[PDB]
């Protein structure tokens, strides 16, 4: 029995992690029933093969591989080197060789100028001795068929796929080959009742395939392409099975902590959420819409209790509740299940498309995804760009009240508001924007400007907004940009901070330093403004301002906001399940700038991890990075290069932001290198 | 300021799409998901409780009722129960078609289903526009059909161990919690201790029609091939699945004909084998009629219409495949070696060898352009390969220049390999241009004179008279040029043909040529040996020889020779002689091997060949136009009449390089020791392990299926030229325009794409243009005016038939879909009787022919009362009438004057003696149950309904129906305002199902006709009562066929 | 629960493997698999189907378990 799952599978590692129940298959009693095949080297071979062939034909050939049949390649040297190899140790020559050549190879003479061996060598080719051969001019289908029957397949090239590669004559003879991928040395497995492999094969009428219909949900690119092609060619001859089916067929006759190893904390499980917008405005109900939420981590769902029942998402105030904000905040948007277009949420209680009560129905997909955004090479300050009307205050307040493990991640002091640059000038940017109106003919007041630019439906005329931008852009680029530049330059001094902006071009024109993120929201931001009362210049002015910023932004696809909160929260929440019991003295750490004259030390990064991980961290070259500290409210500046992220770990979830302060006197600018001042235990 | 603005960027959608990726579609198309297996119950109708049973009660002790003993029941034990459609509510499928149709119990609102299509203008969430009811219903029916396209699966059985049945075999459902299914599948298995409704019904049934009925056990020790079982189901879905399986079975093939087809298509170079023994009835649905292939081919042509970027990558793909399979490869050094031997003097200012080698420059990458030129032969219908402008001499050249002579030589050898019909004229004019001033000929007119660029002559109309009639060229005044013209007429290559393909499996997509036939612009002559040797008896060899001889005559002409030194003349003629006898193997390859390779490759193309006849020099038969149509004109109905004036021309030229093709023609070599039957056996073997062709066949089937579904559906809301049934006219619908039809077609296309899991694009070319007059045809026209057209006679379509069947059924079971037929009557009725408002007593209703009624039309106008006089309104007969009696309104009349009418009539309706009948046709409805023993007034519901009517939307009609009782009860007054016009209460299933009988309120036993098999001892087991009554207990056929991959059963011999 | 064709093929491989071991050689000289004959329609007896021709994806006892559990009635309230 063979089952293919849409994830990379390895013989030793994927077993330790609950890969099957990372999808949802229980598989209670192991009983040595499930077995895994290593397919990583197959993926590497596929990547290498992509350098000489189309993806489609390579995939098509690879599909026909039988994974329950054992076979392997046998790399050979080039011909000229093969003969000279046979000259040394003339005991490996196959019996198929011409007797004249064999007799001449054992001559024990130098054979430099034999002048008869020359002709014999010239009129010789490898195919005369080895029947199945691949010579870099062979279709992949031929290779797959050759491995399908027979145990040894001979080849004169390393660009082959499907199985391991063994060596013929010692490495000295192979000079054209340099890759060290999986080429086994000259030195030289059964099947369980079930077998799990990444790839799906059609070599048998009943090689099963996992659910695998959620093509978009597959994280890895290569696996996604493989599955897409397979179902786009052979849709009607596949045996699709669901996790419940797998659980049954594993636990048929039997039903009636991952051991101890290093644990990654940036692998989280997410599910698709199905629900609807039932309206109970009267004693009866409605089924107005059916929607889906895409990337909801399981840790959050288990943390704050989520059953399947008739949930209400509004309080007496009239606005949305906090937990619903967080839940929608951690996802990748919504989608209507009838029309497959994107969906956006109306926050206010305004008749068109109101959401008051919802009812959960079920959870369909489940897979593990990496959380590292992969643009996090170095530990740098973070700048997030959100449009106006994005619940900034609510998000900040909710984030501040998170004290998971005695560290209080994301404090209010470590975040800077978008508008903070605004009041640096005694006349803020906003009143200058208000006064813009004087530069427009036919407009005598800000109110006149508002009624001029809008068309009674709160829509810019798409031309008058043109001259609004014409007048507004010089103000921004001549006044806001320099003050923003100084503001960010000073802000970097106090340490790592979370920065919010309204358009990325603000940060670009201010020469901002650090990771840049453009994030969007699954809501109608514009409607969020005019309901928010107690505005200074009127809500309509805020609408016009938001339109101006949106036009000011660059052309770049903004990711979902959840990609940030997931990294901010989920690793810590997962690690709490492991460290929540141990002694904090041993399972804690601290990274900071060292300055000799008790001793000067200012914290930089806070580390929490198990004892073994911290001990491994203890021996690292923390002295390689230097900075200049000046002075409790101390502040420093890094010279050279910033700290690479992998130096921390793929383990040991840490703090994204920090504030510089000296623990208990002349102002000094001595020097700094950072040291692993974590702890003794 | 709560003006509800900025709610318009909502649902308003987007249709414009940038579609530069036609190449990806053309090179590879997603396969439809045809075969799917359902292991659950083949049903879509669910009985649901509405009001919990009156248990315990003061009349009967609790020990009487069956529920008190925790006995499972086949039916809900409730005071009221109803039937609700819920597609695949019990299914257990492997692949989801994601097109479920689900309603709620009528006590729960269901309005959102009927506002799903075109109510983008509707504001309220509780309302819907009546004028799109028909469109919404059609969409609902289409999704209902699509969600049920499944094949029943054979699971397994087990003999009963209890005396409840006489040792029947009971089928076991998969999945968890299978306990509840056994009580639902087999109602007859229940015990009958009581006198209650359910027990009585069960006791009045036959006892041997349960469980497994018949089976076909072929192989001892394998799965039974199929079985027949008595189990809960519905006749409608059973019929749908039966016809679906019938279509699939018609599309079936078996391994033997598969190996025959594969052997045939490989021209005998590949041998494959099939097993010879009792099989297990695999299902391999790959055979379709030629008509579907032609339809798909025409659609595919219309995509690439007049665009070069869409077709060019296909040619590169074919070139790569040819280079992979062909045994011909470039000789690196042949030209240089043969030209290094010519003798010449070092004192000459010029050297012919230098010039020729400089112009040739054999960059070895020229065989790519040679291969694309070869591939062009298969698609002269849409692609016309031509020689690029840059190949011709810049200013026109001159015969005295050596460089121009070599350019003419290159062009002369390159031209005959292109598919351009106007090639020979350009070959002649190329020399004519160089020969101007030196030697003159008469031309047609002052525009296309002898000094035009040769490439300008591109159409048959520009063929010079002197070229078609040789005698006009003076043998004295123009010897060389007349000689060239004679050579062109006498030695231009002759087209031929060759047979290919495997029609009995692959069909044939040829349009203007006979099936199996593949045309070539070169005469094919099969080789009779497998060890080729050099030979000079070829068309192209003769062509090269004649060209060399013409150049040699030109050099030696006494009027031109004295301009050259004798040594240069000798060198030039020696070079020409060397070129004449070069040992290039390419002409042999083209004459003998290349047609075989093309015949092998062609059936496996993703885009099958599309050719028009090759004419050598018959200027009358040169094709001039190829067009397709997708619409029809205003009144024309017959496609053969509108095809001429409603076609769009299709085609695009492609530019090639003469230098590269000449290099290919001059420098071809074979492997040192070639044996064709071994080389091809080795090369072709892998490429017939590809199963893409069958996938393409399935895609082609779905294309025609969808086209027919589209036309049938559109023929409902509008008027078309095709005959069609019509059962949904009573449902109101707006006056459809072109935009409405386009939107409806977009919805249909989206639904079909979603159902079959297609990620590419379908039906899109038809969406452009008006979909109300679609028709498929193609034609081409010769120069002389004779035209040829092909009208593919549309085959059947199972989905359209099944959709129409479901529509016909809906004409009787509309209540089950939460739809009420007829009209409503608004008027106060106060009494203590318990008749259901859905089945009103006859005396309360009236209609247009009832005496003493008033009918109202478009002229609504009211005269207010003065000084106590009652207000009056104008009848349709011109009478002034007070606000009393019985009236009749078309509904739109109230929609357009909602507020005024409410304000004027609500008081009289509520308290006076006014009763109104509103004409609706069809409308969604809502139920509100109430306790008979308590006072109940329904004025609030009717008031809300009346006040919420909008000139765009109306809400669901509310009804107040009493709750049935099984024991004596008191009575209390009830005030009713809304009643239906005719019977609309077919949805109800049973009342007091767990009690001995119903005393008060509406009464209804189990519908006996729904269980005709059990209730009637004389009915044959396989009887159905469609389309009037859908049954709930049927005979279902469950299959266990295998669907192996092709390569699993047919394995080639390496 | 393995396909009959698979078992016929899987059994063939094992027999071939033991042939090699019996003759102390890596590659068996005589093989029961990868022969010229296209014996695709071959079936081998497997535990996937019961004696009624039904799928054995659920055991007989368990199928009887659900079957007669739906007929039981409990002592009244």
Asked whether B658 and B387 are in contact (CB, 8 A), the reply is yes
Q: How many CB atoms lie within 10 A of CB A349?
A: 13
Give phi and psi for B420, each to the nearest 5: -65, 120
Q: Is C31 on the interface with B (CB under 8 A)?
A: no
Chains with at least 3 CB pairs less than 8 angstroms from chain A: B, C
Task: Confirm or reject contact between C57 and chain B (CB < 8 A).
Answer: yes
What is the maximum span of chain B, computed from C-alpha positions, in angstroms? 135
Residue C24 to chain A, least CA–CA distance (Å)? 16
Q: Which residues on chain A are in Cβ contact (under 8 Å) with C26?
A: 151
Tokens of residue A474, six digits = 């010089």
CB-based contact B375:B318 (threshold 8 Å)? yes
H/E element, A550: helix A539-552
Phi, psi (rounded to 5 degrees) for B513: -125, 155
**Hey, are the CB atoms on B156 and C63 less than 8 Å from each other?**
yes
Decide: helix, strand or coil at residue A171. helix
Which H or E run contains A626? Answer: strand A626-630
Contact residues, chain A, for B324 at CB < 8 Å: 139
Tokens of B622: 């040169």
For residue A225, what is the DSSP state? H
**3-state SS assignment for residue B238:** helix
DSSP state letter for B31 = P
Residue B92 region by backbone torsions, left for phi larger than 0, else alpha for psi between -120 and 50, else beta: beta
Alpha helices, DSSP H only, in chain C?
Answer: 4-22, 60-69
Other Cβ atoms less than 10 A from the Cβ of B697: the count is: 21
Phi then psi for residue B752, to 5 deg, are: -65, -40
Q: Order of strands across the sheet with B45-52? A: B45-52, B78-85, B988-991
Residues in chain B: 1054
Cα separation of A40 and A8, whole Å? Answer: 7
C6 close to A (CB below 8 A): yes
Contact (CB, 8 A) for B759 and B137? no
Contact predicate A500/A416, CB 8 Å = yes
- Provide, as residue numbers in chain B, all residues whose Cβ is less than 8 Å from the Cβ of C64: 158, 161
Of C52, C57, C66, the CB nearest to B178: C66
Rounded distance, CA B56 to CA C38, Å? Answer: 71
CA B929/CA B959 separation, integer angstroms: 8
Q: Does B851 touch chain C (CB under 8 A)?
A: no
- Cβ(B535)–Cβ(B588) below 8 Å: yes
Distance (Å, whole) CA B1049 – CA B197: 56
Kindly state the helix (H) or strand (E) to which residue A494 belongs, with its residue range. helix A481-494
- The 10 Å Cβ neighbour count of residue A619 is 8
H or E element in which residue A613 lies: helix A611-618
DSSP letter, residue A131: S
Minimum distance, in Å, between the CA of residue B109 and any CA atom of chain A: 6
CA-CA distance, B82 to B245, in Å (whole number)? 31
Full strand arrangement of the beta sheet holding A208-209: A34-36, A194-197, A2-4, A208-209, A239-240
Closest CA to B982 of B914, B923, B915: B923
**Experimental technique used to determine this entry:** cryo-EM
Q: How far, in Å, CA of A195 to CA of A459, rounded?
A: 60
Closest CA to B612 of B700, B517, B526, B503: B517
Cβ-defined contact of C73 to B69 (cutoff 8 Å): yes
**Rounded (10°) angle between helices B539-556 and B479-491:** 180
C56 touching B, CB under 8 A? yes
Q: Are B736 and B745 in contact (CB under 8 A)?
A: no
CA distance A234 to A214: 16
Q: Which residues of chain C make contact with A130, given a CB cutoff of 8 A?
A: none
Dist CA B853 CA B871 (whole Å): 18
DSSP A476: I
C-alpha angle with apex B65: B60 to B69, nearest 5 degrees?
A: 135
Q: How far is B980 from chain A (nearest CA, A)?
A: 22
Radius of gyration of chain C (CA): 22
C55/B274 touch (CB, cutoff 8 Å), yes or no = no
> Which residues is B916 bridged to in the sheet?
B826, B887
Q: What separation in angstroms does the CA of B996 have from each of A680, B54, B65, B66, B200?
A: 83, 12, 10, 11, 9
Q: Contact at 8 Å (CB) between B700 and B293?
A: yes
Residue B68 has its nearest CB partner, among C36, C52, C77, at C77
Continuous segment of H or E residues that includes residue B498: strand B496-499
- In angstroms, the CA B316 to CA B300 distance is 19
Would you call A205 and C6 a contact, using CB atoms and an 8 Å cutoff?
A: yes
Helix spans in B529-675 (H): 539-556, 566-580, 586-592, 594-601, 639-642, 658-666
Task: Using an 8 Å CB-CB cutoff, list chain B residues near A528.
Answer: none
Residue A532 token pair:
């928010």
CB proximity list for A453: less than 8 A, separation 6 or greater? A460, A461, A464, A465, A468, A544
In whole angstroms, what is the distance from residue A493 CA to residue B91 CA?
Answer: 64
**CB-based contact, B104 to chain A, within 8 Å:** yes
Please report the DSSP string for A74-99 in residue order. Answer: EE---HHHHHHHHHSSTT---TTS-H
CB of B407 closer than 8 Å to CB of B608: no
Cite the beta strand spans of B899-1032 per DSSP E: 914-930, 936-937, 954-955, 957-962, 974-980, 988-991
Alpha-carbon separation of residue B337 from A120, B331, B340, B589 (angstroms): 29, 11, 5, 22
What is the distance between the alpha carbons of residues A383 and A395, in angstroms, rounded to a whole number?
A: 15
**What is the Cα–Cα distance from A541 to A426, expressed in whole angstroms?**
20
Torsion of CA B6, B12, B13, B15, to 10 degrees: -120
- End-to-end Cα distance, chain C: 45
CB atoms within 10 A of CB B332: 12
Helix residue ranges, H only, B986-1032: 1012-1015
Do you find a cis peptide bond into B153, omega within 30 degrees of 0?
no
Q: Is B619 helix (H, G, I), strand (E, B) or coil?
A: helix
Q: Which residues of B touch A244 (CB under 8 A)?
A: 175-176
Count of other CB atoms within 10 angstroms of residue B208: 11
Distance from the first to the final alpha carbon of chain A: 50
B1039, B804, B1013, B811: which is closest to B235 by C-alpha?
B1013
Give, for A292, the enclosing helix (H) or strand (E).
strand A290-297
Alpha-carbon distance of B469 to B475, in angstroms, equals 13
Strand ranges for A25-117 from DSSP E: 34-36, 72-75
B1014-B1016-B1021-B1024 Cα dihedral, nearest 10 degrees: -100
Whether A333 contacts A522, CB under 8 Å:
yes
Which secondary structure element, helix H or strand E, spans residue B520, and what is its range? strand B517-520
In this complex, is the C-beta atom of C58 within 8 Å of any C-beta atom belonging to chain A?
Answer: yes
The whole-angstrom separation of Cα B639 and Cα B791 is 8
Work out the angle at residue B930's Cα, subtended by the Cα atoms of residues B927 and B931, and round it to the nearest 5 degrees: 160
Rg from Cα positions in chain B:
41
Phi, psi for B960 (deg, rounded to 5): -115, 105
H-helix or E-strand spanning residue B211: strand B211-215
Query: CA-to-CA distance for A580 and A613, rounded, in angstroms?
Result: 16
What is the C-alpha separation between B337 and B60, in angstroms, rounded? 115
3-class secondary structure, B408: helix
CA–CA separation, A657 and A654 (whole Å): 9
Beta-bridged to residue A312, according to DSSP, are: A357
Task: Say if C1 is an interface residue toward chain B (CB within 8 Å).
Answer: no
- Phi first, then psi, for residue B428 (nearest 5°) are -65, -50
Nearest alpha-carbon partner for B482 in B553, B561, B407: B553
Q: Which chain B residues touch A530 with a CB distance below 8 Å?
A: 1
**CA dist., res. A286 & res. B977, Å (int):** 24
Size of interface A-B (CB pairs under 8 A): 117
Residue B1013 in contact with residue B251, Cβ under 8 Å? no
Task: Using CA coordinates, name the residue in chain B closest to A532.
Answer: B1
**Cβ of B569: how many Cβ atoms within 10 Å?**
14
CA distances from B209 to A268, A611, B221, B229 (A): 54, 71, 27, 9
Q: Which residues of C touch A248 (CB under 8 A)?
A: 57
Chain A interface mutation, best of C6, C14, C49, highest count of A Cβ atoms under 10 Å:
C6
SS3 of residue B38 by DSSP = strand
Both tokens assigned to B639? 């496609």
With CA atoms as reference, the chain C residue closest to B69 would be: C76
With an 8 Å Cβ cutoff, are C1 and A249 in contact? yes
The Cα of A343 is separated from the nearest Cα of chain B by a number of Å equal to 9
Sign, CA torsion B671/B675/B677/B682? negative
Contact predicate B326/B336, CB 8 Å: no
CB B425 within 8 A of CB B464: yes
Burial of A590 (0-12, 13-18, 19+ CB in 10 A): middle
Angle (CA) B301 B303 B305, round 5°: 70
Residue C55 pairs with which residues in a beta bridge?
A: C49
Nearest to A233 by CA among C42, B463, B27: B27
Judge contact between C10 and A1, C-beta under 8 A.
no
Q: Identify whether the C-beta of residue A363 lies closer than 8 Å to the C-beta of residue A275.
A: no
Task: Please state, in angstroms and rounded to a whole number, the distance separating the CA atoms of residues A530 and A546.
Answer: 12
Secondary structure class of B82 (helix, strand, coil): strand
Q: Residue B779 has what DSSP assignment?
A: E
Inspect the interface and report whether the beta carbons of A287 and B104 lie closer than 8 Å: yes
How many residues are there in chain C? Answer: 77
Stated as kind and residue range, the H or E segment containing B708 is: helix B692-717
**Alpha-carbon distance A385 to A252, whole Å?**
53
Give CA–CA dist A343/A352, Å, rounded: 14
The length of chain A in residues reads 681
Look up residue B953 and give its two tokens: 């939307």
3-state SS class at A143: helix
Q: Which of residues 1031-1050 of B touch C (CB under 8 A)?
A: 1048-1050
Q: How far is CA B729 from CA A90, B720, B821, B923, in A?
A: 93, 15, 12, 14
Those chains having 3 or more beta-carbon pairs within 8 angstroms of chain B are: A, C
Chains B & C: contacts with CB separation below 8 Å: 106
Compute the distance between CA of residue C60 and CA of residue C48 in angstroms, rounded to an integer: 12
C-alpha A384 chain-centroid distance: 18
Contact assignment for C76 to B157 by CB distance below 8 Å: no
Helices (H), A217-358: 221-233, 243-250, 298-303, 322-329
Nearest Cα to Cα of residue B833 among B1002, B1004, B991:
B1002
Query: CA-to-CA distance for C52 and B139, rounded, in angstroms?
Result: 43
- The answer to whether B383 and B651 have CB atoms below 8 angstroms apart is yes
DSSP states along B493-522? PPPEEEE---HHHH----SSS-TTEEEESS
Contacts of A102 (CB under 8 A, 6+ apart): A90, A93
Angle between helices B539-556 and B402-414 (to 10 degrees): 160
| Nearest CB to C27 within list A151, A248, A252 | A151
Alpha-carbon gap, residue B962 to B835, rounded angstroms = 8
CA neighbor of A415 nearest in space, from A342, A351, A498: A498
DSSP A282: S
Report the C-alpha gap between B273 and B259 in whole angstroms. 6
| Strand bridging mode B914-930 / B819-831 | antiparallel
Query: Which chains lie within 8 Å of chain C at 3 or more CB pairs, if any?
Result: A, B
What residues pair up with A627 in beta bridges, in sequence order? A638, A672
Residue of B nearest to A248 (CA): B175
List for chain A the helix, strand, coil content (%; round to 5): 35, 20, 50
Is C61 at the interface with chain B, CB within 8 A?
A: no
- How far apart are the two ends of chain B, measured CA to CA in Å? 80
Question: Which whole-number Å values give the CA distances from B1050 to B254, B275, B690, C37, C42, in the listed order?
Answer: 10, 8, 12, 11, 13
CA dihedral B415, B416, B420, B425 (to 10 degrees): 70
Per DSSP, the three-state class of A64 is coil
Judge contact between A505 and A511, C-beta under 8 A: no
B179/C69 Cβ within 8 A = yes
* Separation CA A459–CA B896 (nearest Å): 30
Distance from CA of B31 to the nearest CA of A (A): 6
- The string of DSSP letters for B816-854 reads TTTEEEEEEEEEEEEES----TTS--GGG---TTSSS-E
Q: How far apart are CA B1050 and CA B744, in angstroms?
A: 45
* Rg from Cα positions in chain A: 33
């Amino acid at each position: 029995a063979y089952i293919a799952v849409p994830a990379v599978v390895d013989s030793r590692s994927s077993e330790a992690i609950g890969l099957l129940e990372s999808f949802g298959v229980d598989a209670g009693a192991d009983a040595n029933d499930v077995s895994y095949q290593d397919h990583d080297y197959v993926l590497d071979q596929l990547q290498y093969m992509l350098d000489g062939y189309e993806a489609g034909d390579v995939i098509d050939a690879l599909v026909h591989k039988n994974w329950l049949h054992h076979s392997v390649y046998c790399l050979l040297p080039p011909k000229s080197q093969l003969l000279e190899y046979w000259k040394s140790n003339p005991s490996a020559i196959p019996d198929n060789v011409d007797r004249r050549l064999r007799k001449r190879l054992m001559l024990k003479k130098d054979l430099r100028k034999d002048d008869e061996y020359n002709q014999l060598a010239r009129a010789f080719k490898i195919s005369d001795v080895y029947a199945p051969l691949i010579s870099s001019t062979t279709s992949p289908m031929t290779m797959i068929q050759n491995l399908n029957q027979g145990e040894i397949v001979y080849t004169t090239t390393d660009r082959v796929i499907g199985a391991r590669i063994l060596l013929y004559a010692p490495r000295k003879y192979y000079a054209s080959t340099l890759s060290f991928t999986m080429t086994k040395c000259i030195i030289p497995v059964p099947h369980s009742r079930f077998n799990v492999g990444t790839f799906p094969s059609i070599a048998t009428p009943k090689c099963f395939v996992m659910s695998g219909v959620d093509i978009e949900s597959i994280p890895n690119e290569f696996i996604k392409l493989f599955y897409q092609r397979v179902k786009s060619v052979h849709a009607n001859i596949l045996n699709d099975i669901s996790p419940q089916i797998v659980s049954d067929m594993i636990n048929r006759k039997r039903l009636r902590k991952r051991g101890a190893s290093h644990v990654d904390v940036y692998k989280v499980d997410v599910v698709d959420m199905l629900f609807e917008v039932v309206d109970v405005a009267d004693g009866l109900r409605n089924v107005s819409r059916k929607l889906t939420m895409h990337t909801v981590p399981v840790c959050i769902l288990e943390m704050l209790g989520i059953e399947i029942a008739d949930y209400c998402i509004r309080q007496e105030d009239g606005m949305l509740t906090d937990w619903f904000l967080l839940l929608t905040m951690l996802s990748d948007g919504l989608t209507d299940r009838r029309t497959h277009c994107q969906y956006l949420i109306n926050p206010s209680s305004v008749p068109p498309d109101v959401i008051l009560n919802i009812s959960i129905t079920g959870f369909i997909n489940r897979h593990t995804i990496d959380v590292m955004p992969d643009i996090y090479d170095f530990v740098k300050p973070i700048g997030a760009v959100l449009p106006k009307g994005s619940f900034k205050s609510t998000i900040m307040r909710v984030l501040d009240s998170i004290s998971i493990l005695g560290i209080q991640i994301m404090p209010r002091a470590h975040v800077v508001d978008s508008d903070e640059v605004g009041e640096q000038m005694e006349p803020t940017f906003e009143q200058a924007v208000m006064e813009i109106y004087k530069g427009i003919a036919g407009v005598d007041s800000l109110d006149d400007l508002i009624k001029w630019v809008l068309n009674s439906d709160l829509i810019p005329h798409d031309d008058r907004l043109g001259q609004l931008f014409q007048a507004f852009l010089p103000l921004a680029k001549d006044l806001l940009a320099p003050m923003a530049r100084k503001f960010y330059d000073n802000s970097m001094s106090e340490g790592r901070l979370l920065t919010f902006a309204h358009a990325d071009s603000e940060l670009l024109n201010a020469n901002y330093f650090g990771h840049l993120l453009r994030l969007k929201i699954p809501y109608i931001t514009e409607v969020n403004l005019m309901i928010r009362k107690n505005r200074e210049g009127g809500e309509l002015f805020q609408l016009v301002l938001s339109y101006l910023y949106k036009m000011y932004a660059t052309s770049a696809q903004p990711k979902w906001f959840g990609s940030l909160l997931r990294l901010l929260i989920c690793p810590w929440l997962h690690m709490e399940k492991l460290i929540g019991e141990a002694d904090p003295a041993s399972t804690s750490a601290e990274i900071g700038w060292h300055i000799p004259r008790e001793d000067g030390f200012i914290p930089y990064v806070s580390i929490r991890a198990p004892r073994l991980v911290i001990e491994e961290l203890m021996e690292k070259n923390w002295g390689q990075y230097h900075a200049q500290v000046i002075v409790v409210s101390a502040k420093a500046v890094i010279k050279g290069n910033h700290l690479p992220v992998k130096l921390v770990s793929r383990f040991a979830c840490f703090t994204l932001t920090a504030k510089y302060e000296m623990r208990l006197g002349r102002g000094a600018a001595y020097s700094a290198r950072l040291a692993f001042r974590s702890d003794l235990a | 300021e709560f003006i509800s603005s900025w709610q318009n960027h909502p649902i308003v959608q987007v249709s414009a799409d940038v579609e530069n990726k036609k190449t990806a579609q053309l090179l590879h198309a997603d396969t439809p998901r045809l075969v799917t297996w359902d292991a659950g119950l083949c049903t879509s109708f669910k009985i649901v409780p509405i009001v919990p049973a009156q248990v315990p009660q003061d009349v009967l002790a609790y020990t009487f009722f069956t529920s008190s003993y925790a006995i499972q029941s086949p039916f809900p034990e409730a005071a009221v129960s109803r039937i609700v459609v819920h597609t695949r509510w019990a299914s257990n499928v492997d692949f989801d078609r994601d097109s479920s149709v689900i309603m709620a119990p009528p006590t729960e609102n269901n309005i959102h289903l009927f506002k799903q299509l075109l109510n983008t203008e509707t504001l309220s969430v509780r309302g819907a526009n009546p004028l799109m009811f028909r469109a919404n219903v059609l969409h609902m029916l289409l999704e209902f059909v699509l969600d049920n396209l499944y094949l029943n699966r054979h699971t397994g059985f087990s003999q009963d161990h209890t005396p409840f049945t006489e040792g029947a075999n009971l089928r076991s459902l998969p999945g968890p919690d299978a306990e509840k299914w056994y009580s639902i599948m087999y109602p007859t298995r229940m015990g009958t201790p009581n006198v209650s409704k359910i027990c009585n019904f069960v006791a009045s049934c036959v006892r041997n029609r349960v469980g497994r009925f018949d089976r076909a056990q072929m192989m001892n020790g394998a799965m039974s091939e199929w079985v027949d079982v008595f189990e809960t189901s519905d006749a409608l879905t059973v019929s749908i699945r039966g016809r679906w399986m019938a279509r699939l079975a018609r599309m079936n093939i078996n391994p033997t004909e598969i190996e025959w087809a594969l052997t045939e298509c490989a021209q005998g170079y590949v041998t494959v084998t099939s097993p010879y023994a009792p099989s297990v009835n695999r299902l391999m649905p790959y055979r379709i009629s030629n008509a579907e292939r032609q339809i798909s081919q025409i659609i595919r042509i219309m995509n690439i219409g007049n665009n070069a970027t869409v077709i060019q990558p296909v040619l590169q793909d074919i070139s790569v495949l040819l280079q992979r399979i062909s045994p011909l490869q470039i000789d690196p050094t042949i030209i240089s070696n043969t030209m290094s031997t010519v003798s010449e003097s070092t004192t000459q200012t010029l050297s012919p060898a230098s010039s020729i080698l400089g112009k040739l420059r054999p960059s070895n990458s020229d065989f790519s352009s040679f291969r694309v030129a070869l591939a062009g032969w298969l698609y002269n219908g849409v692609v016309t390969t031509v020689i690029d402008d840059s190949s011709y001499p810049k200013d026109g050249g001159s015969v005295t220049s050596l460089e121009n002579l070599w350019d003419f030589f290159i062009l002369a050898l390159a031209l005959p390999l292109t598919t351009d019909p106007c090639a020979p004229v350009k070959a002649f004019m190329t020399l004519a241009n160089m020969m101007v001033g030196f030697e003159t000929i008469p031309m047609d007119n002052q525009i296309y004179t002898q000094s035009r660029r040769a490439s300008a002559f591109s159409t048959p109309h520009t063929w010079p008279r002197c070229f078609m009639n040789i005698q006009l060229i003076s043998p004295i005044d123009a010897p060389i040029l007349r000689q060239w013209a004679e050579i062109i007429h006498r030695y231009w290559p002759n087209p031929s043909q060759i047979r290919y393909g495997a029609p009995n499996v692959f069909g044939s997509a040829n349009l203007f040529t006979p099936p199996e036939v593949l045309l070539l612009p070169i005469d094919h002559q099969p080789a009779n040996v497998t060890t080729p040797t050099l030979d000079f008896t070829n068309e192209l060899t003769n062509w090269r020889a004649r060209v060399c001889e013409l150049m040699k005559n030109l050099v030696d002409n006494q009027r031109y020779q004295p301009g050259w030194t004798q040594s240069l003349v000798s060198s030039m003629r020696g070079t020409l002689d060397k070129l004449k006898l070069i040992k290039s193997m390419t002409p042999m390859y083209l004459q003998q091997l290349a047609p075989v390779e093309l015949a092998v490759i062609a059936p496996m193309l993703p885009f099958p060949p599309f050719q028009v006849p090759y004419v050598r020099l018959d200027r009358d038969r040169v094709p001039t136009m190829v067009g397709v149509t997708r619409q029809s004109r205003d009144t024309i109905t017959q496609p053969a009449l509108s095809l001429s004036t409603t076609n769009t021309t299709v085609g695009v030229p492609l530019a090639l390089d003469a230098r590269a093709i000449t290099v290919a023609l001059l420098s071809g070599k074979y492997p040192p020791d070639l044996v064709t039957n071994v080389w091809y056996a080795d090369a072709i073997y892998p490429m017939y392990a590809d199963t893409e062709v069958f996938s393409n066949l399935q895609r082609d089937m779905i294309t025609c299926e969808a086209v027919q579904t589209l036309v049938t559906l559109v023929a409902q809301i509008s008027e078309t030229q095709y005959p069609v049934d019509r059962y949904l006219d009573w449902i109101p619908s707006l006056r459809a325009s072109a935009a409405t039809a386009a939107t409806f077609a977009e919805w249909v296309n989206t639904s079909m794409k979603t159902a079959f899991d297609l990620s590419d694009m379908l039906l899109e070319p038809l969406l452009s243009g008006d979909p109300r007059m679609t028709q498929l045809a193609i034609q081409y026209q010769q120069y002389n005016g004779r035209t040829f057209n092909i009208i593919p006679e549309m085959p059947g379509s199972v989905i359209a038939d099944c959709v129409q069947l479901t529509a016909e059924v809906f004409n009787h079971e509309y209540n089950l879909f939460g739809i009420a037929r007829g009209d409503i009557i608004i008027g106060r009725v106060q009494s203590t009787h318990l008749w259901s408002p859905l089945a009103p007593p006859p005396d309360l209703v009236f209609d247009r022919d009832t005496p003493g009624v008033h009918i109202f039309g478009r002229d609504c106008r009211i005269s207010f009362g003065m000084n106590g006089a009652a207000p009056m309104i104008r009848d349709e007969t011109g009478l002034m009438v007070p606000f009393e009696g019985n009236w009749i309104f078309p509904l739109a009349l109230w929609q357009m004057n909602t507020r005024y009418f409410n304000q004027q009539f609500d008081a009289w309706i509520k308290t006076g003696e006014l009763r109104i009948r509103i004409e609706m046709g069809a409308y969604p409805y809502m139920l509100h149950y109430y306790d008979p023993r308590q006072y109940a007034n329904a004025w609030n519901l009717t008031s809300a309904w009346l006040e919420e009517i909008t000139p765009t939307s109306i809400p669901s009609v509310p009804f107040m129906v009493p709750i049935s009782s099984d024991h004596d009860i008191s009575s209390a007054p009830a005030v009713q305002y809304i009643i239906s016009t005719e019977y609309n209460d077919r949805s109800l299933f049973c009342t007091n199902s767990s009690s001995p009988q119903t005393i008060a309120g509406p009464d209804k036993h189990i519908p006996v006709e729904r269980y005709n098999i059990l209730t009637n001892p004389d009915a044959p087991p396989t009887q159905i009562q469609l389309p009037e009554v859908v049954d709930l207990y049927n005979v279902v056929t469950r299959y266990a066929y295998e669907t192996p991959p092709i390569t699993a059963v047919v394995m080639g011999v390496p | 629960l393995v396909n009959e064709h698979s078992e016929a093929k899987d059994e063939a491989d094992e027999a071939t493997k033991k042939q090699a071991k019996d003759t102390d050689k890596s590659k068996a000289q005589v093989t029961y698999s990868d022969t010229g004959i296209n014996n695709a329609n071959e079936l081998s007896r497997s535990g996937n189907v019961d004696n009624e021709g039904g799928s054995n994806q659920k055991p007989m006892s368990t199928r009887i378990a659900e079957a007669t559990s739906a007929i039981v009635s409990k002592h009244p309230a």
